[PDB]
């Protein structure tokens, strides 16, 4: 069971580069609007201390340099949204495809298209972990790579890249500038909070054992959602919540296995350790697939 | 450090649907050919058992149903390139990207765009492994579904996706429509090659794992590289050769670690194993991922 991005081409076509001063990096053009990090604005110093209203205040339409590749889009309007600029370009995208954006939870997946001075570099699939950090893939020049989701070729754009951590994990948005996790966009010393296991994907990697004849590890016994989660925070795994219940719903009708009867399958796993079995080839319990990811993996979704 | 596909937007405006009789697959459209696996030309009972040149003879273009999303390509012209199919169409693919035709050599990587019915699904990085099969991630319809490299917007395609063997890895053709491995496309049980583990790849993603921090398999020892690949074969792995080596050095020079010191840890690795610890993430010894797919990604 490997790891699968979206197709990418949908969002390939919206990665513009965006300048102001010496500073370039990456903007969604979606219609007439270009979305970046304000950080932006900031010169290498500035970002030490920003006052982000009093340098915008400063900047002018002019003063933006948006490129889709070598090519300008005259700056009509400039707004800061939260942690975002929105630029308004005098062009409307013609591969602006249907889209949403969506604030996604700590656990959700979602591909993300690495890019470097508004050119595509790759794609792979990424976590939101429950410390709101991603364990992504990015240089120096990645700033304003964007994180999304596809369904039925409406493209929901969930994350925009803005720093890098200390332990080298990263930091980003919504597209509505929102951060994800207690993260500021100023160069201080910031970390990233303790990690939890993704109890939710854990459950849905389970379910996938199970579908593909691996079950060895199904018990006997059940338990409450209320027990299993003060256990499971013992074992710094995350707590469920009802939607994760619900979300587990598709894979436990599809199995046959109740959830709370996978629950009690995974506390005695933490319990008592694997005991140098396997699961689906790994002794290690996988929890960046979520129940969607096992759904997609087993259906030609589109 | 995560394994990571190209963009697939190159590939995804070449992808189509094609139909004959009851079967339906995928095949990729470039200029005014499509390209797609030949058996999609033989019935439930034919792949059983066929003789695809007599089985061509006698079909007709009308024979054949294109769909490229909603419009529907007359084919105009059909041929057999070995296992490939390739149907001339009435109309040229605009989206066409400049292209290439490449067979890629065991241990070398690439991204997998996987379709159903003309339409994407999903893309990732897959290594054609020693043995010369795939493992993929492909389900029922996923045929005609692509492998490819991108350099400077250059797409070179070098999988089309056939079958899937009983032991669930993958198989399939070059775009010349050649077998990569001695596989056959009639539907009979079809067992592999044993298989080894690519050890430039290893020592690459030990090299990144160095990159990112982390150095707990790291020892004082050294060896000699025919030492190295006495241990090696003992252990399934493909020998090291000088070449690889000298690919790796840009990797050793990067982080001051030599390659045959390299050599020593991973060989210390594979006689003691991993004690229960992990590296950047995984419990087993990772090849997928080449010397140049570290460069790139740690640089
Ligand atoms: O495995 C596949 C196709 N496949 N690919 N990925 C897959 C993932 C999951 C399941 C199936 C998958 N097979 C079986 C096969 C095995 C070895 C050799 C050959 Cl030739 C076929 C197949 C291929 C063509 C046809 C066909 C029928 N009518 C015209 N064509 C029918 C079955």
Redesign the interface.
Known sequence: ??????????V??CMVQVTCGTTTLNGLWLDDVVYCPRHVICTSEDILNPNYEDLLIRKSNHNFLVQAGNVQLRVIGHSMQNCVLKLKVDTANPKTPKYKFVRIQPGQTFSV??CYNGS???????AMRPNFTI???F?NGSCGSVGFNIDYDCVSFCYMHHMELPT?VHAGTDLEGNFYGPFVDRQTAQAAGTDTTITVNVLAWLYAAVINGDRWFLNARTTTLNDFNLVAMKYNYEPLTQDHVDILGPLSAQTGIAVLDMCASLKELLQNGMNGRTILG???LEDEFTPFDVV???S???
């Open positions: 069971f490997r790891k699968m991005a979206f197709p990418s081409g949908k390939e076509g298209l690495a595509p570099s790759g794609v792979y699939q990424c364990k992504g893939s240089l080298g790994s002794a290690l997609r993996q087993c030609g979704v589109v």
